[PDB]
Structure formats: structure tokens, C-alpha cells
Amino acid sequence: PALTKSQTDRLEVLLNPKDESGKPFRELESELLSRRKKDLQQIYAEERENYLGKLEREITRFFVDRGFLEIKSPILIPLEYIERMGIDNDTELSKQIFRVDKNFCLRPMLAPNLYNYLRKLDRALPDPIKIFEIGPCYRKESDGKEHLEEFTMLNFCQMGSGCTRENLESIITDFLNHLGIDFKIVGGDTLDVMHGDLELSSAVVGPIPLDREWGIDKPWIGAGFGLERLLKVKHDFKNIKRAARSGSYYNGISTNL
Amino acid sequence: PALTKSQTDRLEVLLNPKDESGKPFRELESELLSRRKKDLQQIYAEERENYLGKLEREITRFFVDRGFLEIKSPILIPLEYIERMGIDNDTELSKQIFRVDKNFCLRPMLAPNLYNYLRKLDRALPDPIKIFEIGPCYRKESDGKEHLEEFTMLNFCQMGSGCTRENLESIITDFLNHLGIDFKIVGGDTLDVMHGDLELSSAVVGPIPLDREWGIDKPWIGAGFGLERLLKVKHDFKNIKRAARSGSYYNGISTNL
Ligand SMILES: Nc1ncnc2c1ncn2[C@@H]1O[C@H](COP(=O)(O)OP(=O)(O)NP(=O)(O)O)[C@@H](O)[C@H]1O
Ligand SMILES: Nc1ncnc2c1ncn2[C@@H]1O[C@H](COP(=O)(O)OP(=O)(O)NP(=O)(O)O)[C@@H](O)[C@H]1O
Ligand SMILES: CC(C)(C)OC(=O)NCCCC[C@H](N)C(=O)O
Ligand SMILES: CC(C)(C)OC(=O)NCCCC[C@H](N)C(=O)O
Ligand SMILES: [Mg+2]
Ligand SMILES: [Mg+2]
Ligand SMILES: [Mg+2]
Ligand SMILES: [Mg+2]
């Protein structure tokens, strides 16, 4: 008669935001099953593009058109970069690092590599230097509703001329308005782009003391966004896992049919 | 008078395939330096796209237009997948795995995830099932002229109808001809796509015994290509490192100016 918690969980997996009690579990499940196969079949026939990939390409076109240089840096970076990022056994991050071998780890952020690119490009390109990168990042997490251990990050930044908070907020605003994501900006000067109680991004207006360790000596602005969180808001997924790289979902549809 | 080996190495770093002795090192280096800044400045003004990223997008459009489903699976996979891929302490791969924690490792290939997608999608999509994925892979290597420890792989495959060697070679041929890469196909049936003595890809025509461990029971074809190797051939880089994710090069130009 009444659906068990476990049965409800299974139904929620097959449930899509677009869908609209009483009937038995087997009926409800068969209904949802035929629907997802249908959605999957539609993707396969018409678009065939992966949400995460499609988003990355959409973000790339956005910044490339706005004068930012597309960067693809190593995902596997030296542990030494962590220490130099000011990540000591005093911050939360220190306990979220996935170590590899004895000298490396999985980048928990894009900052270090972008820092290097800013210093190096400054010697070859005209002010201001504008770069961005979209790629995998890794952190050990306790949560699983707004956090993934393997997520995708977007970090763009400008160094030199025009690096003001107003300009930064202008970029943030044009970006999210372009993607159709509702947000509110709240807040070296630091800002947080929020959607409800979900943190979409953290932005900072430099210069900041840490800049010196990386050979940076000019003002700059920048923000980092989690692609899965943007996907979560846009497609209204209730759980961040439906947007993550995985073998359990495809464009938010359960592959366990 | 004569350039030292070390000076030659430095010049080669700044050297591009398009360029055309006697003069002193400082002169030669200053000449090359102004040239690279120029190239970099041109990229920044006109295109702004990263080679590796641009290639991925070009590969994606290719297969998407040809009916293949774009997949983005986890880069950090379970070690159990390695064992199930038939990778024992009998093969070379067993010694090339980058372990993470006690139960995970960095995917040294895309096979396991794609295997799962084939089994699952088979229950929802019409035959044949066509999928592909482009993403980072990791292997410990002794070489550094044709091997990277962090490289990018493309693996496409079709399961069900039309899975013949002829069709496989046809896909391979249209693909490389599209990218403008010279090659020769040589060779469960297995093929190697070569460029000189450089292995561009390994393709296999199933079914193969390993299929059973993953719940696969239909014929299939597929090939895996290294994106950095394709870039190496296309842009004529002498060293694979100029195409790799890095902080030392950008679209093959040295960032150490
Ligand atoms: N574990 C994660 N899973 C998914 N996205 C993440 C994760 N960690 C960070 N992000 C995204 O990356 C953005 C910038 O990173 P960062 O500012 O370090 O996040 P945080 O401050 O760790 N956020 P949070 O853990 O939710 O309090 C965050 O605002 C998120 O959009
Ligand atoms: N270490 C690497 N660096 C760059 N590309 C690689 C690397 N390993 C494999 N690839 C690419 O991935 C393709 C398919 O993988 P695989 O067939 O396992 O390579 P392999 O057989 O290990 N090739 P090789 O190591 O040169 O003899 C190879 O043909 C290369 O194009
Ligand atoms: C200075 C630092 C590391 C905080 O930020 C950068 O160097 N670059 C981009 C910053 C993006 C905001 C925030 N640092 C993030 O992790 O997303
Ligand atoms: C069966 C197996 C694992 C060898 O291949 C696949 O399951 N899928 C794609 C194969 C691509 C060729 C080769 N396996 C490679 O690693 O590129
Ligand atoms: Mg956190
Ligand atoms: Mg934050
Ligand atoms: Mg090998
Ligand atoms: Mg091979």
C-alpha cells in the first residue's frame, strides 16, 4: 500500500524535475522507466551532447569571445603547489587533498597553475592579461548533496588594467545571465555568488599577500565556479550527483534502467 | 663560437617548426624570443583557443555528427576496474598505475567506463549503440619523447549492428583524413594505426573474451587515440611535451620567455 523509503529512493532516481500517489510501486516504476528510456532515446536521436561537456564548451565560447585565453593545465600537480597556496594544516583544505605518489596530488583547485600562467604571460602579452580554465578538481568531502569529490571548475581572471570589483561583478553578472542562472552577489576583497544557500562561486579582488609567492605584482580579479553546481541549479537537479561525471547518470537521466 | 649543447637545447625550446648557424647564442635567442612573443600575441589577439581543447571540440563534433553519444566518465576510478580489465602483474600496465588512496587509481584508459555505458545503454537505446569519450588518462612512463604521464585519450566504439573491421577502418580513415594526419593501418582482431614508427592508435574488433566480465555479448568495434600524439604529428612538434597540458608551453610556444 504505502511505498517504502527504499522504494521512494528508487523512484526519485528515475524521477525527473519535469514530471507531474496511490498506484503500486511496480506500476509507478515501470511508468518512470519507459519515460527515461524515452528521454535517453531522444538525446541519442537529436542532440547526443553531454551536459557537462556542452556546458564547458558554452563557458569556453563565452570567455574566448570576451578576450580571455583558454588554458589547459595539468590536473596532477606537485604537492609543493599546495604548500605555496598557503594551505597549511590550519585550513580545511589540508585534509581534502588526494595525494598521488610521494610528490604529487590531484589539483583541488586551478589557482596555482593560473598563477604561473599570469606571471609568464605578463612577459609576452599586452596588459591586461586575461585567462581562464575549465577542468577537473578533487577534494575529499563529507557532504554529498552539494559536494562531489571529483568536480569541474571554471576559473577566469584578469590581471593589470581594469581590475576592479565593479568589473568583476559585471563579468559575473553577464556570465550567469547568459546561462540563465539566478544569483545574488554577497560579501583582499572577497565575494560569494549565491543561489539560495548554495555557493555557486567565490571571487576575489586582488592584489592579495599570497601574490608575492607566485611572482605577481599587479591588481587582478577572478572567480571560480563549480560546473556541476551550475548544472544543478539550471536543470533543477535535487542532488548534485546527477550532474557529475559518472556511470549512474547521463544528462541527469538514470542509466540504471 | 660553437653553441654548447645546453645552449642548443634552449634554442630548440624557442624553436618552432616553421622557422628557417654562425651568429652568437645571445643573438639567436633574442631573435627567437621576439618571435615567440609575436606568435603568442597573435593567438591572444585573433584565436585565443587552446590546441588541446580545440582538438577535443573538433573530435567531439566529428563523432557527434556521426551518431556517437558523448560521454564524460570519472577520471578517478576504482582499482577493481583495473583487475577486471585483465591487467595482472603479468602485463606492463600493472606497473604504470597511479594509485590514489587504498581503493582508487587514475584511469590509465577509458575502457572500463565505456564498457559500463555499453551494457547500460544497450537496455535503453536502439541497436547499434555508439559512444565515445575524450578525457585525461594516466600512466607511469620511462620515455618522454612519445609518452606523457598525463595524456588525453579519445575512445569511440560501436556495439551491435555493422561492427566489422571494414567499418572500423572506414571510421579511422575518415577521422584522420578529416584532421589531416597521415597514417597507415597495420595488424579478437587487433589493429594499430601508425604514423612512421609512432603509434597513433590501437583498435580492436570484438567480441573478445574480456567482454563477458563486463556483461557484453554482442559484436563491437572501437579504437583509442592519444590527442597529444595527433597534435605532435599535425603541428610537427619534435617532442610530445609541446602538446601536453603544461605550464611550459602554450599551443606549442614556450612560455619561458
Ligand atoms: N566539492 C565540490 N563539489 C562541487 N563543487 C565544488 C566543490 N568544491 C568547490 N566547488 C565549487 O568551486 C567553487 C570555488 O571553490 P571554493 O571557493 O574553494 O569552494 P568552497 O569555498 O570550498 N565552497 P564550499 O565547500 O561549498 O563551502 C565553489 O564555490 C563551488 O562552486
Ligand atoms: N603515455 C602515453 N602518452 C601519450 N599517449 C599515449 C600514452 N599511452 C597511450 N597513449 C595513446 O593512447 C593510444 C591507445 O592506448 P594503448 O594502445 O594502450 O597505447 P600503448 O599500446 O600503451 N602505446 P605505446 O605505449 O606507445 O606502445 C596509444 O596508441 C597512444 O596514441
Ligand atoms: C588567489 C586565489 C588562489 C585565491 O585565486 C586565484 O589565484 N585565481 C582565481 C581565484 C578564483 C576564486 C577562488 N580562489 C577559487 O578557488 O575559485
Ligand atoms: C576491450 C578494450 C578494453 C580493449 O577496448 C574497449 O573496451 N574499448 C575501446 C578500445 C579502444 C582500443 C584500445 N583498447 C585502447 O586502449 O585504446
Ligand atoms: Mg569546501
Ligand atoms: Mg568559498
Ligand atoms: Mg604503453
Ligand atoms: Mg597499442
- What 3 state SS string does chain A have? CCCCHHHHHHHHHHCCCCCCCCCCHHHHHHHHHHHHHHHHHHHHHHHCCCHHHHHHHHHHHHHHHCCCEEECCCCEEEHHHHHHCCCCCCCCHHHCCCEECCCEEECCCCHHHHHHHHHHHHCCCCCCEEEEEEEEEECCCCCCCCCCCEEEEEEEEEECCCCCHHHHHHHHHHHHHHHCCCCEEECCEEEEEEECCEEEEEEEECCCHHHHHHCCCCCEEEEEEEHHHHHHHHHCCCCHHHHCCCCCEECCEECCC
With contact defined as beta carbons under 8 Å apart, do A233 and A198 qualify?
A: yes
Taking an 8 Å cut-off on Cβ atoms, the answer to whether B72 and A50 are in contact is yes
Query: A108-126 burial, b if ≥16 CB within 10 A, otherwise e?
Result: bbbbbbbbbbbbbbbebbe
Which residue numbers come right before each break in chain B (C to N over 2.5 Å)?
20, 187
Give the number of other CB atoms < 10 A from CB of residue B72.
21
Domains and CATH numbers, chain B: 1-48 (1.10.287.540), 49-257 (3.30.930.10)
Q: Quote the Cα angle for B164-B167-B170, to 5°.
A: 150
Q: Terminal CA-to-CA distance of chain A, rounded, Å?
A: 24
Up-side HSE of residue A257: CA atoms within 13 Å toward CB?
A: 28
Q: Tell me which chain A residue has its CA closest to the CA of residue B35.
A: A124
Residues of B in contact with A69 (CB under 8 A): 43-44, 48, 50, 250
Q: Give the Å distance between the CA of B84 and the centre of ligand 4.
A: 13
Q: Tell me which chain B residue has its CA closest to the CA of residue A33.
A: B124
Mutate to test the interface with A, among B14, B30, B50 (most CBs of A within 10 A): B50
Residues of B in contact with A138 (CB under 8 A): 76
Q: Terminal CA-to-CA distance of chain B, rounded, Å?
A: 24
Distance between CA atoms of A63 and A126, rounded to whole angstroms? 17
Q: Give the Å distance between the CA of B100 and the centre of ligand 7.
A: 20
Q: Are strands A129-138 and A69-71 parallel, antiparallel or unpaired?
A: parallel
Question: B202: Cβ–Cβ under 8 A, 6 or more apart, which residues?
Answer: B190, B191, B192, B193, B223, B224
Up-side HSE of residue A106: CA atoms within 13 Å toward CB?
A: 28
Residues of A in contact with B113 (CB under 8 A): 247
State if residue A108 touches ligand 1 by the CB under 6 angstroms criterion: no
Give the number of other CB atoms < 10 A from CB of residue A54.
16
Q: Give the Å distance between the CA of B109 and the centre of ligand 4.
A: 8
Q: Which helix (H) or strand (E) holds B254?
A: strand B253-254
Distance between CA atoms of B108 and B136, rounded to whole angstroms? 9
Give one DSSP letter per residue of B122-165, joined into a string: HTTSPSSEEEEEEEEEE---S-SSS--SEEEEEEEEEESTT--H
Listed as own residue / partner, the contacts of A193-202 with beta carbons closer than 8 Å and 24 or more positions apart are A193/A223, A193/A225, A195/A229, A195/A233, A198/A146, A198/A229, A198/A232, A198/A233, A199/A146, A199/A229, A200/A176, A200/A225, A200/A226, A200/A229, A200/A230, A200/A233, A201/A172, A201/A225, A201/A226
What sign does the CA torsion over B89, B73, B70, A9 have?
A: positive
Distance between CA atoms of B133 and B72, rounded to whole angstroms? 6
Listed as own residue / partner, the contacts of A50-54 with beta carbons closer than 8 Å and 24 or more positions apart are A50/A250, A50/A251, A50/B69, A50/B70, A50/B71, A50/B72, A51/A231, A51/A235, A51/A243, A51/A251, A51/A252, A52/A152, A52/A227, A52/A228, A52/A231, A52/A243, A52/A244, A52/A245, A52/B72, A53/B60, A53/B70, A53/B72
Cell digits of residue B217: 555479448
Question: Between A227-235 and A51-65, two packed helices, what is the crossing angle to 10 degrees?
Answer: 110
Q: Tell me which chain B residue has its CA closest to the CA of residue A69.
A: B48
Smallest Cα distance from B228 to chain A, Å: 12
* Collapsed DSSP state (helix, strand, coil) of residue B202: strand
Mutate to test the interface with A, among B250, B254, B256 (most CBs of A within 10 A): B250
